Design a protein around this ligand. Structure first.
Ligand code: ZN
Length: 184
């Protein structure tokens, strides 16, 4: 149901960290599921989901992931560390489902590293990601090391190197400052 990797064209088209970006109607979600216990850190599952940014939340990458995880990684007692590399942050409805999921599964931790911020409404801007962070999720902007890590593991790079966008650095700086404001 998830793929192993996306092709290079897809990665470049969807993970460019322009704060204002039109036409990227999908969310791509790269995940690593690890069994984590202090210094032990076992890679357990990896893959890629694609979903819609809009339409009903059943079509969203985050619910694609959650439905797969509950059906295929649970039931289990392990301590899971879930890492996402996402092209957009989650919509407010998926924030609510993810926050509820985390509150009911204290053995799961989630980190979301995003290429871009979802365009939140006035009401959701200082609420949605704040609620998710308060439920214990770590929400951050994807930095260069994470883009390179994604190129290596979630892209059919076929030997090529990751070539970052010319505005990468100032885009990152603007996004990091905006998220800091969103989270207090
Ligand atoms: Zn959603």
């Amino acid at each position: 149901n998830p793929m192993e990797r996306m092709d290079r064209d897809t990665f470049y088209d969807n993970f460019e960290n322009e704060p204002i970006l039109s036409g990227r109607s999908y969310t791509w979600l790269c995940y690593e599921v690890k069994i984590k216990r202090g210094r032990s850190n076992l890679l357990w599952d990896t893959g890629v989901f694609r979903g819609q940014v809009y339409f009903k939340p059943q079509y969203h990458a985050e619910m694609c992931f959650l439905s797969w995880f509950c059906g295929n990684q649970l039931p289990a007692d392990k301590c899971f560390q879930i890492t996402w590399f996402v092209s957009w942050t989650p919509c407010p409805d998926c924030v609510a489902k993810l926050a509820e999921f985390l509150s009911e599964h204290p053995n799961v931790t989630l980190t979301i590293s995003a290429a871009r911020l979802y365009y939140y409404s006035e009401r959701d801007y200082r609420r949605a990601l704040c609620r998710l962070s308060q439920a214990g999720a770590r929400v951050k902007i994807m930095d260069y090391e994470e883009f390179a890590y994604c190129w290596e593991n979630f892209v059919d790079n076929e030997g090529q190197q990751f070539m970052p966008w010319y505005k990468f650095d100032e885009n990152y700086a603007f996004l990091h400052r905006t998220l800091k404001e969103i989270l207090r």
